Amino acid sequence: FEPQDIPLDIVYEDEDIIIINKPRDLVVHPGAGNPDGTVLNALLHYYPPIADVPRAGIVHRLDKDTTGLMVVAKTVPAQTRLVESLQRREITREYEAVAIGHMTAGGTVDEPISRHPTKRTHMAVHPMGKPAVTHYRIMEHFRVHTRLRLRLETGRTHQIRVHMAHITHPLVGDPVYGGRPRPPKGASEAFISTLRKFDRQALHATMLRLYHPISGIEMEWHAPIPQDMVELIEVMRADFEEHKDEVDWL
């Protein structure tokens, strides 16, 4: 838990909170396999006085390869209130994602989650796990993929990733829950290439809304999807247009 010179993309900061847009390949808190090089280390470097705050102000987290907005507390009073707001579900975070398979409707995945028995670094859906609820809506259709927006009622480890895989729609690029299957038929070279290069779950926390812990004023931030997802979506969109062009000139 030493400070490390790790650049953070600060979207907003006041006397009490910091909002950051987290990139891929960045673990939030030290753990098995990641002793350092995390957001916590970066925060200790950016604002050393944050060391006096539990878990360095970290109230909520995002997977290493999941991108997006997160709020960090700069003081104990802010941290305590943020954690309470979080537990009361008064902190809304919306995610954008691209899933495998053509989906015909939005919905909800309400399936208990538990640690995987065999795999130590895996989570899994199981009837004797703990309650988990994921809501999703279809934003855009692709040939054999779907662009989604999600909101959660619970926020467990790998929840979205394991929930989507459970309903046979794992996130594209997910190296753990089946997000890297063989490319679809009729795929162009650029499409096959883009899919080959996209090696992380296509998941981004694009919106964060909360009540300031001190002022109580409602605030909201937006973070556009990263360039990697933009390119992924652009090629899927190109593929779908070509697909829909099948008999447009017949």
From Swiss-Prot:
Instruction: Note whether RNA-binding occurs among the keywords.
Output: yes
GO biological process terms, semicolon-separated: enzyme-directed rRNA pseudouridine synthesis; ribosomal large subunit assembly
**Catalytic class of the enzyme:** isomerase
Any keyword RNA-binding?
yes
Record note on disruption phenotype: Severe growth inhibition, makes only very small colonies. No longer synthesizes pseudouridine at positions 199, 1915 and 1917 in 23S rRNA. In this strain a miniTn10(cam) insertion has occurred; the first 196 residues are present followed by 12 extra residues before a premature stop codon.
Known catalytic reactions: uridine(1911/1915/1917) in 23S rRNA = pseudouridine(1911/1915/1917) in 23S rRNA
The UniProt entry annotates the active site at: 63
Kindly report the protein's main subcellular placement as a broad class: cytoplasm
Q: Which GO terms describe its cellular component?
A: cytosol
- Offer an example of a GO molecular function term for this protein: rRNA pseudouridine synthase activity
**Compartments reported by the entry:** Cytoplasm
* Enzyme Commission code: 5.4.99.23
**Which keywords accompany this UniProt record?**
Cytoplasm, Isomerase, Ribosome biogenesis, RNA-binding, rRNA processing, rRNA-binding
Q: Which domain of life is it from?
A: Bacteria
Q: Which family does it belong to?
A: Belongs to the pseudouridine synthase RluA family.
Query: How is the quaternary structure described?
Result: In late stage pre-50S ribosomal subunit interacts with ObgE and DarP(YjgA).
Describe the function of this protein.
Answer: Responsible for synthesis of pseudouridine from uracil at positions 1911, 1915 and 1917 in 23S ribosomal RNA. Other positions are not modified. Uridine isomerization occurs as a late step during the assembly of the large ribosomal subunit. Member of a network of 50S ribosomal subunit biogenesis factors (ObgE, RluD, RsfS and DarP(YjgA)) which assembles along the 30S-50S interface, allowing 23S rRNA modification and preventing incorrect 23S rRNA structures from forming.
Provide the protein name: Ribosomal large subunit pseudouridine synthase D
In its UniProt entry, the species of origin is given as Escherichia coli (strain K12)
Region of the whole protein represented: 77 to 326 of 326
